[PDB]
Design a protein around this motif. Structure first.
Motif, PDB file in Angstrom:
ATOM      1  N   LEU B   2      73.439  44.615  45.086  1.00  0.00           N
ATOM      2  CA  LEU B   2      72.050  44.333  44.621  1.00  0.00           C
ATOM      3  C   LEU B   2      71.147  45.488  45.049  1.00  0.00           C
ATOM      4  O   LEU B   2      71.336  46.046  46.131  1.00  0.00           O
ATOM      5  CB  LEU B   2      71.435  43.044  45.212  1.00  0.00           C
ATOM      6  N   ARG B   3      70.146  45.812  44.247  1.00  0.00           N
ATOM      7  CA  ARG B   3      69.232  46.912  44.605  1.00  0.00           C
ATOM      8  C   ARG B   3      67.826  46.444  45.002  1.00  0.00           C
ATOM      9  O   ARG B   3      67.191  45.646  44.277  1.00  0.00           O
ATOM     10  CB  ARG B   3      69.087  47.852  43.421  1.00  0.00           C
ATOM     11  N   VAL B   4      67.305  46.995  46.090  1.00  0.00           N
ATOM     12  CA  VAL B   4      65.938  46.735  46.484  1.00  0.00           C
ATOM     13  C   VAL B   4      65.233  48.079  46.601  1.00  0.00           C
ATOM     14  O   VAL B   4      65.753  48.989  47.264  1.00  0.00           O
ATOM     15  CB  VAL B   4      65.889  46.024  47.847  1.00  0.00           C
ATOM     16  N   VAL B   5      64.101  48.235  45.928  1.00  0.00           N
ATOM     17  CA  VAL B   5      63.273  49.430  46.098  1.00  0.00           C
ATOM     18  C   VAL B   5      61.967  48.983  46.717  1.00  0.00           C
ATOM     19  O   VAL B   5      61.362  47.975  46.271  1.00  0.00           O
ATOM     20  CB  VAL B   5      63.004  50.162  44.784  1.00  0.00           C
ATOM     21  N   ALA B   6      61.546  49.688  47.771  1.00  0.00           N
ATOM     22  CA  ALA B   6      60.351  49.263  48.532  1.00  0.00           C
ATOM     23  C   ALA B   6      59.337  50.407  48.588  1.00  0.00           C
ATOM     24  O   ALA B   6      59.618  51.421  49.197  1.00  0.00           O
ATOM     25  CB  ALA B   6      60.752  48.850  49.917  1.00  0.00           C
ATOM     26  N   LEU B   7      58.209  50.262  47.882  1.00  0.00           N
ATOM     27  CA  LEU B   7      57.196  51.300  47.848  1.00  0.00           C
ATOM     28  C   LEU B   7      56.220  51.091  49.022  1.00  0.00           C
ATOM     29  O   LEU B   7      55.674  49.993  49.203  1.00  0.00           O
ATOM     30  CB  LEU B   7      56.418  51.238  46.560  1.00  0.00           C
ATOM     31  N   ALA B   8      56.041  52.152  49.806  1.00  0.00           N
ATOM     32  CA  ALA B   8      55.208  52.096  51.010  1.00  0.00           C
ATOM     33  C   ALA B   8      54.052  53.077  50.789  1.00  0.00           C
ATOM     34  O   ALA B   8      54.182  54.308  51.045  1.00  0.00           O
ATOM     35  CB  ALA B   8      56.049  52.469  52.255  1.00  0.00           C
TER      36      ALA B   8
END
Lengths: 192, 184
Positions: B2-8
């Motif tokens: 599964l892919r998680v992208v986290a914009l900070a």
């Protein structure tokens, strides 16, 4: 005039709570309009942390440069069974000494296992969350776990189980240095 | 897998991105590839004299299972300075089925992107007025700290996002979980 926080982040597997604690502390210093507040993240070998999501976290101070600090935060060590025995003894000596010299020692998440091991608790009582409470019992059966508290203060040692919620301890320290209104602004910021 | 992208978006307030990844990744060990990105793909300057170097660029991602949008700090300063191309990217991922998880003032980002189909949101009382001035058509749910609108999840926090995180964990995976939930 000036206040120093040194935050030791033992592992990039679990360093978010160190960062959130500094965000809360610095935010409160801004509410207090206090100008001499300085914080430093340090790592056990002074190398970058390898965090989740493919990040590297590079500090700009070594723990050995600090002979004094008002507050020391000891973050998560992850699984103590993995890490506790691998911690540099010189780092235990440094925590022990800072405590003997009167630094406030704030231990969060499995950082609590570090202060247990180091003997900092004068009363031998502690707190731990359910995920690691059994292990804490195996390693420190002489330390009574206060099973209905999420935080505990013993002299200058502050314990907060978390793993991610450390409001009661952080606000306590805020009230000590900055007073009630700053703490209450902190509390409102946190929407507790 | 599964892919998680986290914009900070800001090094001033990024801890809650990191904790979200620690929870998700830890949950999955009991059963994610995750990626931190920054709006300009440069290091964040975080508190305590650190710099946080990302190793992926946001443009590289044409799909994700979960996209997390972190705090933008003070929206009065930051919201206007967010690259318009990032709003397009958020919208595109959402159409390709991503869960979009907005935390703390990250919620202003998804409101502006137009993702709140049901015109409800949540926001800390201290930013509620600013949010109303910018988004006068959205209703704020004063008694709630989290809200789910279709595939869009809001969590005010600023630091405790246990209900949304556990909801997501349950979606994918059906004492650790209890340790997380107990802090709600």
């Amino acid at each position: 005039k000036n206040l120093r926080v040194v935050a030791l982040a033992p592992t990039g597997r679990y360093f978010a709570s160190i960062i959130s604690s500094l965000e809360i502390l610095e935010t409160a210093a801004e509410f207090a309009e206090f100008q001499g507040f300085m914080t430093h993240v340090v790592t056990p070998n002074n190398r970058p942390l390898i965090g989740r999501g493919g990040i590297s976290v590079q500090p700009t101070a070594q723990w050995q440069s600090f002979d004094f600090t008002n507050i020391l935060i000891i973050g998560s060590i992850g699984d103590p069974l993995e890490s506790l025995d691998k911690i540099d003894p010189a780092l235990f000596d440094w925590i022990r000494e800072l405590h003997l010299k009167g630094s406030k020692i704030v231990a969060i998440d499995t950082g609590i296992f570090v202060v247990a091991k180091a003997g900092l608790l004068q009363q031998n009582k502690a707190v731990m969350h359910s995920y690691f409470a059994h292990l804490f019992g195996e390693l420190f059966p002489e330390i009574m776990l206060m099973t209905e508290q999420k935080a505990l203060i013993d002299g200058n040692v502050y314990l907060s189980s978390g793993p991610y919620s450390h409001s009661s301890v952080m606000l306590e320290i805020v009230e000590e240095y900055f007073g009630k209104h700053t703490r209450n602004l902190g509390n409102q910021f946190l929407s507790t």
